[PDB]
Amino acid sequence: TGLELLYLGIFVAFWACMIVVGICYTIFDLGFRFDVAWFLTETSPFMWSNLGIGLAISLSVVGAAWGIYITGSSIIGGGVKAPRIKTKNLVSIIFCEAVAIYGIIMAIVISNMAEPFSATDPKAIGHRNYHAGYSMFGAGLTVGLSNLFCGVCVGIVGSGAALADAQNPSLFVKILIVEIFGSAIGLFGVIVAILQTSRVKMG
Amino acid sequence: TASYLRLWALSLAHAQLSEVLWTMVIHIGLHVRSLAGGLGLFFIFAAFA
Amino acid sequence: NNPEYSSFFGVMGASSAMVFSAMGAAYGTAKSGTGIAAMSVMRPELIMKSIIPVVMAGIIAIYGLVVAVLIANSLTDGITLYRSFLQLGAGLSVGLSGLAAGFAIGIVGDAGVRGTAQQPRLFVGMILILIFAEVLGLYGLIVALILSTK
Amino acid sequence: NNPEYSSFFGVMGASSAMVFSAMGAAYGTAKSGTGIAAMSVMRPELIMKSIIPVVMAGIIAIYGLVVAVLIANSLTDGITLYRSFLQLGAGLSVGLSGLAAGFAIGIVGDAGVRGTAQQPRLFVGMILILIFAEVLGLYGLIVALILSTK
Amino acid sequence: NNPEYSSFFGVMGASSAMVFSAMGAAYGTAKSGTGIAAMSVMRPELIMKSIIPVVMAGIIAIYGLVVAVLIANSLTDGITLYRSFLQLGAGLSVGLSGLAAGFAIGIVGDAGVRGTAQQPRLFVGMILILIFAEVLGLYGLIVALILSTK
Amino acid sequence: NNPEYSSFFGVMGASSAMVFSAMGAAYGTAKSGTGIAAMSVMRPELIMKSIIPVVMAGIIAIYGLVVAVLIANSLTDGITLYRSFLQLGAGLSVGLSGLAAGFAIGIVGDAGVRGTAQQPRLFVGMILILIFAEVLGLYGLIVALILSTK
Amino acid sequence: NNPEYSSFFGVMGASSAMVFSAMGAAYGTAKSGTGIAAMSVMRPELIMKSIIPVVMAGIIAIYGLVVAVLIANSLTDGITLYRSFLQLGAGLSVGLSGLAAGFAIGIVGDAGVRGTAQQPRLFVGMILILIFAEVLGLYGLIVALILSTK
Amino acid sequence: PYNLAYKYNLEYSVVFNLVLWIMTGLALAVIITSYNIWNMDPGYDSIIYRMT
Amino acid sequence: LCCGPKLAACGIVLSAWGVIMLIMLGIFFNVHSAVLIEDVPFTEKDFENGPQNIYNLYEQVSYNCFIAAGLYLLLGGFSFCQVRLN
Amino acid sequence: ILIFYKWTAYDAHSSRNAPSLLIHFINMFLFSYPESGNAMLYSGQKGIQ
Amino acid sequence: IHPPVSYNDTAPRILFWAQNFSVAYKDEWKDLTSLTFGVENLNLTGSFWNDSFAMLSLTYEPLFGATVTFKFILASRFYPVSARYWFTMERLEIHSNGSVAHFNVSQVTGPSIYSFHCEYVSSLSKKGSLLVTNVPSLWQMTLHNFQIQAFNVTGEQFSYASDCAGFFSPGIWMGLLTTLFMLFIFTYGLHMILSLKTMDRFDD
Ligand SMILES: CCCCCCCCCCCCCCCCCC(=O)OC[C@H](COP(=O)([O-])OCC[N+](C)(C)C)OC(=O)CCCCCCCCCCCCCCCCC
Ligand SMILES: CCCCCCCCCCCCCCCCCC(=O)OC[C@H](COP(=O)([O-])OCC[N+](C)(C)C)OC(=O)CCCCCCCCCCCCCCCCC
Ligand SMILES: CCCCCCCCCCCCCCCCCC(=O)OC[C@H](COP(=O)([O-])OCC[N+](C)(C)C)OC(=O)CCCCCCCCCCCCCCCCC
Ligand SMILES: CCCCCCCCCCCCCCCCCC(=O)OC[C@H](COP(=O)([O-])OCC[N+](C)(C)C)OC(=O)CCCCCCCCCCCCCCCCC
Ligand SMILES: CCCCCCCCCCCCCCCCCCCC(=O)O[C@H](COC(=O)CCCCCCCCCCCCCC)COP(=O)(O)OCCN
Ligand SMILES: CCCCCCCCCCCCCCCCCCCC(=O)O[C@H](COC(=O)CCCCCCCCCCCCCC)COP(=O)(O)OCCN
Ligand SMILES: CCCCCCCCCCCCCCCCCCCC(=O)O[C@H](COC(=O)CCCCCCCCCCCCCC)COP(=O)(O)OCCN
Ligand SMILES: CCCCCCCCCCCCCCCCCCCC(=O)O[C@H](COC(=O)CCCCCCCCCCCCCC)COP(=O)(O)OCCN
Ligand SMILES: CCCCCCCCCCCCCCCCCC(=O)OC[C@@H](O)COP(=O)(O)OCC[N+](C)(C)C
Ligand SMILES: *[C@@H]1O[C@H](CO)[C@@H](O[C@@H]2O[C@H](CO)[C@@H](O)[C@H](O)[C@H]2NC(C)=O)[C@H](O)[C@H]1NC(C)=O
Ligand SMILES: *[C@@H]1O[C@H](CO)[C@@H](O[C@@H]2O[C@H](CO)[C@@H](O)[C@H](O)[C@H]2NC(C)=O)[C@H](O)[C@H]1NC(C)=O
Ligand SMILES: *[C@@H]1O[C@H](CO)[C@@H](O[C@@H]2O[C@H](CO)[C@@H](O)[C@H](O)[C@H]2NC(C)=O)[C@H](O)[C@H]1NC(C)=O
Ligand SMILES: CC(C)CCC[C@@H](C)[C@H]1CC[C@H]2[C@@H]3CC=C4C[C@@H](O)CC[C@]4(C)[C@H]3CC[C@]12C
C-alpha cells in the first residue's frame, strides 16, 4: 500500500494546509484576498471549455475501456471451455463502446459552441462568455463522469453475464436487462449535458 | 444512429493517418532542392511503402 | 497583446498527447508480452499470431504521435489563448483515450493470448474485443483532430 | 518582456529529458538483469545473447541524452518564455515516453529472457515486442525534436 | 542588480546533486552488500570479485560529488537567475540520473552476485549490465556538466 | 539592508545537518544492533568485532554535528540571504547524504554481521562495503564544508 | 448591506444535513441488510422481527431531512452571514451526528441480527443498543434545531 | 515611519510558486527514495530462518 | 547473390509499386499540379516576380522522382534476376 | 430529410442565419422551440416537428 | 525617507508615496522624487476629495518646457457581493500644454480601509506595465514602490496596505490547474504501469 500511502499523505497534507490557510485568511481579516470571484473571472473561459470537451471525450473512453477489459477478460476466460461466449456476449462490449460514442457526440456538440472573444477585461468578456465556459466545463464533466460510471457498471455486469453464460446458455438473455439499465445512465448524462449547453453561446 | 458515426470516425482517422504518414515520410524525400534527393527518395519511399 | 504564457497550454497538450499515449501503449505492450511469454513455453507456433495486441498498442502510440506532431507544428509565437487551450484539450483527449485504450488492449490481449493457447477458436473473439479497445483511442484522436483544427 | 524566469522551463526540460529517460532505461536494465540472472543459472550460453533488452534500455537513455544536450545547447540568457515552454515540452515528451518505453522493455525483456530458457523459439517474439516498446521512446524523441528544433 | 533569492536554486542544485546521487549510491551499496553477504556463506572466494557493484555505486556518488562541487564553486552573491536555474537543472539531472543508475546497479548486482554463486559464467554478463547501468549516471554527469558550465 | 528572515534558512541548515545525520546514524545503529544480537545468539566472540557498523554510523552523526556547529558559529543577525542559502544547502547536503549513508550502513551491517556469524571470510568484505557506504556521508560533508566556508 | 455569498454557507448546511444523514442511513441500511441476508438462510422467521435496524437508520435519514427542509425554508436572499453560519452549523451537526449514528446502527444491527440468529435473548439487548445509537442522532437533531431556529 | 508597506517584489507569485513546487517535488522525491531504501527487502532472507 | 524467394518477391513487388507511383508523382510534379505545392522546396525569394521559379523547382522534384523510379527499376531487375536464379 | 433539405436550400448568402441541425434535433426532442437564436429551417417546422 | 505627499481637506485625505517617481517625454526621462516628496511648496492645486472620489494632482512648473500636471483619479464604491467599500485607482491623466494623455491603471484596487501598494506601477512592460494604453503615447511613468491611500485615511499613517503581489496570478492559476489535471492522468497511468507484475513460474 505504498502508493495509497503516498496519495493519502498528499491528500491529508493538502487539506490540512487548506484548513489552516482558511483559518488564517478569515482570522487575520485577509479574506478579501481570497477572491474566488477574481479566480473564476480572470481564469480564461477557454480553459474551462476545452477542459470540458477533453474530459467529455477522455473519461467516456476511460469508462468504455475499463468496462471492455473487465468484460473481455471474463469472456475470453470462460470461452476456453465454452467458445460460444465469444460469439454471443459481444453485446456487452458493444454497450461499453456506445458509451464512448456518446462521449464523442457530446464532445462535438460542446465544441460547436466555442468562439473567441477578442477581450480580456471581465466586463468585456461578459456573463455570456463566462457562463458559456462554465457550462461547457460542467457539461463535459457530466457526460464524461456519467459515461465513465456507466461503462464500468456495464463492464462489471457483462463480466457477470459472461461467467453465468459459460455455465447455462439461457441466462444471458435475461441478464442483458441489467446491462440495459446500466446503459441508461450514459443516456441520462448525455441528456443533461445537452440541456446544460442548450443556451450556451461564446463570442 | 450514434454508432454509425464510426464510419466518419474511421474514415477521418484513415485520412489523417495517411496525410501525416505522407508529410512525415515522403515529404522529406520530395522537399529537397538538390538533385541528390532522388537517391534519398529511394529509401524514404521504401519506408513509406 | 496576448499573454507571454499562452503557448504553455499548447506545448503541454502536445507533450500529453505523446506521453499518455506512450504510457498506454507501453502498458499494452508489456501485458501482451507477458501473456505471449507465458503462452509460448507450450505453444511456440502462436507467437506471430498472438503479437497482434502489441501492434494495436503501437497503433495507440501512433495516434498519440500524430496528434502531438499536429499540435507541435501548429504552435506559434503569437498563439492565442483560444488556440492554446484548444490544443490542450486535444492533447488531453488523445492522451487519456490512448492511455485507457492501451490498458484495455493490454489486459484483453494478456487474457486472450493465454485463452487462444488453450482454445484456438478464441483468437477471433480476442481480435474482436481488441479492435473496440483500440477504437476507443481512435475516438480520442478524432476529437483531437476536431479540436486542434476548430 | 523575456522575464528573468523564462529559462527555468527550458532548464527543467533538459533535466527532465535526462532524468526520466534515465529512470526508464534504468528500470529496463534492472528488470532485464534480474531476468537474465535467473535464466543463466541453467542456460549459461544465452547470457550474452539475452542482453538485448539492456541495450534497448540504453538506447532509451541515449534518446534522453540527445534531447537533453540538444536543449542545453539552446538556452540563451534572454530566452523567450515561448521557446522555454517548447523546450520543457520536448523534454517532458522524450523523458516520459522513454520512461514508459523503459517500463515496457523491462517487463517484456525480463519475461522473454526467462521464458527463452524454456522455449528457444520465443527469442524472435521477445525481440519484436521489444522493438515495439522501443518505438515508443523513438516517438517521444521525434516529438521532442520537432518541438525543441522548432 | 540581481534578485537576492537567485542563489536558492543554485544551492538546491548542489544539494540535490550530492543528495540524490548519495541516495542512489546508498541503495546500490546496500543491495549489493546484501547479495554479497548472502553469497559469501557458500562461496567465500567471490567476495573481492563481487564487490564490483559497490564500486559502481561509489562512482555514481562520485559523479554527484563532482557536480555538487562544480555548483558550489560556481555560486556567487550576484549569481544571475539564469545561471542559478542552470545549476539547479544540472543538479537535478545528475542527482536523479545517479539515483536511477544506483537503483539499477543495486538490483542487477544483487541478482548477478547471487547467480554467479551458482553459475560462474554469469560474472561477465553481470559486469556488462552494471556497465550499462553506470552509463546512465555517466549521461547524467555529462548533461549536468553541460548545463552547469554553460 | 537585508531581510530580517534571512537567518531562518541558515538555522534550518544547521538543524537539518544535525537532524538528518542523527536519523541516518540512528537507523544504522538500530539495524547493526539487531544484527549484532542475532549474531551473538551463537557467536559471542564476534560481539565486539561486529560493532564496527555502529562506529561508522556514529561517524556519520559526527559529520552532521561538525557541519551543524560550523553553521551555528557562522550565523549572524545580519547574515546576507545568499550566505543563509549557502548554509541551508550545506546543511541539507550533509544531513541527507548522511541519512543515505546510514541506510546503506544499516542494511550492509545487518546482513554482513549475520553472514560473518557463519562465514568469517566475509568480515573484510563487510568492512569494505561499510567504507564504500560511509564515503557517501564523507562526500556530503565535503560539499557542506565547501558551501559553508564559501 | 450583507454579502451576496452569505447564502452559500446556509445552502451548504442544508445540503450537508441531507447528504451526511443519507450516507449514515445508507451505511446502516446496507450493513443491516447484509446481516439480515446472512442470517435469513438458516432462520427465516426472524426477518421481520430483525428489520428494526433498517427502520432506525431510516429515522436517522428523516432527522436529516427535517433539518434540511427547515434550513431550506429559513433561507433567504439577504440572509445575514450570522444566520447563514447558524444554518451551516446546524446542517453539519445533524448530518455528521446522523452519520455517526448510522455507522453505529450498521455495526450494532449487523452484530445483533447475526447473534439473535444464535441467541434469541439478545434481541432486547440489541434493541437497547440501537436505541442508544439512534439517541446520538436525536442529540444531533436537537442541536441542529437550536442552531437553526435562533 | 508613515506605516509604509513592506516592499514586496512584484514577481512574488512567480518566485513563490517556483520555490514551493520545486521544494515539494524535491521533498517528495527524497521521501520516496528514503522509503524505498528503508522498506527495502532486508536481503538476508537466507538467514532469517537460520537465526530465528 | 542467391537469397530467399520470399525476399525476392517482396523486393520485386516493392520495385513495381515504387516505379509506378514515383513515375506518376514525377509526371504530376512536371505538370505542376497545385495539389503537391507543399512538397516543392521553394523559398521566400521564389515569390518575387512570377511562377517560373516554382515551375523550375517542380521540374527538379520531378527529376528526383524519376531518378528514384529508375533506381527502383534497377532494384526490380536485380530481384527478377534473383528469382530466375531461384 | 433535414440534412438533404439544408444542403439544397442554404447557400453562402444565407450563411449568417443558417440553422444547426444538431440544435434543431435537440429542440425537436425537447419541445424547446425558442423565439431567439437560429431561425426555423422551414415554415410550419414547429407544428410538423 | 522622504515624507508622502499628503493632500489634506481639514485632515490628511490622500496620501501618496513612491520610492522613485520618474517620467519620460519622447524617451527623455527625469526624476521627480526630490521635487515631489518633502517639498513644502508642492503645487497640489487642482486636487479634490469627494467622499467617494479622489483626484490627486501633482504639478511641476518647469518640467520639460511646460507646466505639467499628473492627476491620479481613484474612486471607491460599495460592491454588493460584499459589505465592504472597494477603491480603485481608475486612471491617470497627464496634462501638458492644452492637451491630455490618459493611462489606464490595471490592478490598483483594494478595500477602501486599506491603502494599496505595488512595486513598479509603471508604464514599461519590463516593470509590470500597470499603467497601460492602446493609443500610443509620448509619456512613460515609473512609480517604483508606489503606495497610495485616498479613502479612509486617518492621520499621517498609511493604513495596512493591500498590494498587487499575490501568491498566485491568473497565468499561474491556469497553468497549475492544467498541470494538476495532467499530474492526475500521469499518476493514474503510472499506478497502472507499476501494478504490472511478471509471472514467477513457467509451464513444464
Ligand atoms: C501542532 C502544529 C504546530 C503549530 C504550528 C503549525 C505551523 C504554522 C506556522 C507556519 C509558518 C508561518 C509563521 C509566520 C510567518 C509570518 C506571517 C506574517 O507575516 O504574519 C502576518 C499575518 C497577516 O497579517 P497581520 O494580520 O499581521 O496584519 C494585519 C492585517 N489586517 C490589518 C488585515 C488585520 O498575521 C500575523 O501577524 C500572524 C502572526 C502569527 C502567525 C503564526 C502562524 C499561523 C498559524 C499557526 C497554527 C494554526 C493552528 C493552531 C492550532 C494547532 C493545534 C494542533
Ligand atoms: C477537510 C474537508 C474540508 C473542510 C475544511 C476546509 C474547508 C476550506 C478549505 C479551502 C481553503 C480555505 C477556505 C477559506 C478561505 C478564507 C475565506 C475568507 O477569508 O473569507 C471568509 C468570509 C469573508 O471574510 P471577510 O473578512 O470578508 O468577513 C466579512 C466582512 N464583511 C461582511 C464586512 C465583508 O467569511 C467567513 O468567515 C466564511 C467562513 C469560511 C472561512 C473559514 C474556513 C474554515 C476552514 C475550516 C476550519 C474551521 C474551524 C473549526 C475547526 C473544526 C471544524 C469542525
Ligand atoms: C506533503 C505533500 C506534498 C504537498 C502537497 C500539498 C500542497 C499544498 C499547497 C500549499 C499552498 C497553500 C497556499 C499558500 C498561500 C496561502 C498562505 C496563507 O494563508 O498565508 C498567507 C495569508 C495572506 O498573506 P498576506 O496577504 O497578508 O501577505 C501579503 C500578500 N503577499 C504575500 C502575496 C505579498 O495569510 C497570512 O498572512 C498568514 C501568515 C502565516 C502563514 C500561514 C500559512 C498557513 C500554513 C502554515 C502551516 C502549514 C500547514 C501544514 C501543516 C503540516 C502538514 C499537515
Ligand atoms: C505530461 C505531463 C507530465 C506530468 C505533469 C508535469 C508538468 C510540469 C510542468 C511545469 C510546471 C508548470 C506549473 C504551472 C506554471 C505554468 C507556467 C505559466 O503559465 O506561468 C506563466 C507565468 C506568467 O506570469 P503572470 O503574468 O501569470 O504573473 C502575473 C505577473 N507577475 C508575475 C509579475 C506577478 O509565469 C510563470 O512562469 C509562473 C511561474 C510558475 C512556476 C511554477 C513552478 C513549477 C515547478 C516545477 C515542478 C517541480 C520541479 C522539481 C521536481 C523535482 C524532481 C521530481
Ligand atoms: C504519512 C506520513 C506523513 C506524510 C506527509 C508527506 C506527504 C506524503 C509523502 C509520502 C509519505 C509516506 C512515504 C511513502 C513513500 C512513497 C510511496 C511508497 C514508495 C513508492 O513510491 O514506491 C512504490 C511506487 O513507486 C514509486 O516510487 C513511484 C512514486 C513516484 C510517483 C510520483 C507522482 C505523483 C505526484 C503527486 C501528485 C498526484 C496526487 C494524487 C492524489 C510503491 O511501492 P508499493 O506500494 O508497490 O510496494 C510496497 C512498498 N513500496
Ligand atoms: C467545517 C468546514 C468548513 C465549512 C465552511 C465553508 C468553506 C467553503 C470554502 C470556500 C471559501 C469560503 C467561502 C467564503 C469566502 C468567499 C470569498 C470572500 C472574499 C471576497 O471578498 O471576495 C469577493 C468575491 O467573492 C465571491 O463573490 C465568491 C462567491 C463564492 C464563494 C464560495 C465559493 C467556494 C467554492 C465552492 C465550490 C464548490 C464546488 C462543488 C463541486 C470580492 O468580490 P467583489 O465583487 O467585492 O470584488 C471587488 C473587486 N473590485
Ligand atoms: C537537497 C535535497 C532536497 C531538499 C528538500 C528535502 C528536505 C527534507 C525533507 C524531506 C524528507 C527527509 C527525511 C526523510 C524521511 C524518511 C522516510 C522514511 C520512510 C519510512 O520507511 O517510514 C515509513 C513511514 O513513512 C512516513 O512516515 C513518511 C516519512 C515522514 C514524512 C516526512 C515529512 C514530515 C512532515 C513535514 C511537516 C512540516 C511541513 C512544513 C509546515 C514506515 O514504513 P511502514 O509504513 O512500512 O512502517 C512500518 C514499520 N513502522
Ligand atoms: C511538482 C508538480 C508540478 C507542480 C504542481 C501542480 C499541481 C498542484 C497545483 C494545484 C493547486 C494547489 C494550490 C491550491 C491553492 C488553493 C487556494 C490558496 C489560497 C490563496 O491564498 O489563494 C488566493 C487566491 O486564490 C483564490 O482566489 C481561491 C481559488 C481556489 C481554487 C482552488 C482550486 C484547485 C485546488 C482545489 C481543488 C482541486 C480539484 C480540482 C478543481 C491568493 O490571493 P492573492 O494574494 O494571490 O490574490 C491576488 C488578487 N486578489
Ligand atoms: C503496387 C501497385 C501500384 C500502386 C499504384 C498507386 C498509384 C499512385 C499514383 C499517385 C500517387 C501520388 C498522388 C498525387 C495526386 C496529385 C496529382 C494531380 O493533381 O493530378 C492532376 C494534375 O496533374 C493536374 O492538375 P493541376 O495541374 O493542379 O490542374 C490542371 C488540371 N485540369 C487541366 C484538369 C484543370
Ligand atoms: C530614481 O530612479 C532614477 C532613474 O529612473 C535615478 O536617476 C537615474 O540614475 C541612473 C543611474 O545613475 C542614471 O543613469 C539616470 O540618468 C538617472 N536619472 C534619469 C532621469 O535617467 C534616481 O537616482 C532615482 N532616485 C531615487 C532613488 O531617489
Ligand atoms: C498650482 O497648480 C495649478 C493647477 O495646475 C496651476 O494653475 C493652473 O492649472 C491648470 C490646470 O492644471 C493648468 O492648465 C494651468 O496652466 C495652470 N496655470 C499656470 C499659470 O500654470 C498653478 O499655476 C500652480 N501654481 C503655482 C504657483 O505654480
Ligand atoms: C462627490 O459626491 C457628490 C455627492 O456628495 C457627487 O454627486 C454625484 O455626482 C455624480 C457624478 O457626476 C452623479 O452621478 C450623481 O448624480 C451626483 N449626485 C449624487 C447625490 O451622488 C459628486 O459627483 C462627487 N464628485 C465628483 C467630482 O464626481
Ligand atoms: C556513451 C554514448 C553511447 C552516448 C551516445 C552517443 C553520443 C556520443 C551522441 C549520439 C547523438 C549525439 C547528439 C546528436 C545531436 C546533437 C545536437 C547538437 O546541437 C548538440 C549535440 C547533440 C545533442 C549530440 C550529443 C551527443 C550524442 C548524444
Ligand SMILES: CC(C)CCC[C@@H](C)[C@H]1CC[C@H]2[C@@H]3CC=C4C[C@@H](O)CC[C@]4(C)[C@H]3CC[C@]12C
Ligand atoms: C574523515 C576524515 C579522515 C577526512 C579528512 C580529509 C581532509 C584532508 C579533507 C576532508 C574535508 C576537506 C575540506 C572540505 C572543504 C574545505 C573548504 C575550503 O574552503 C577549504 C578546504 C576545506 C577546509 C577542505 C580541506 C581538506 C579536508 C579537511
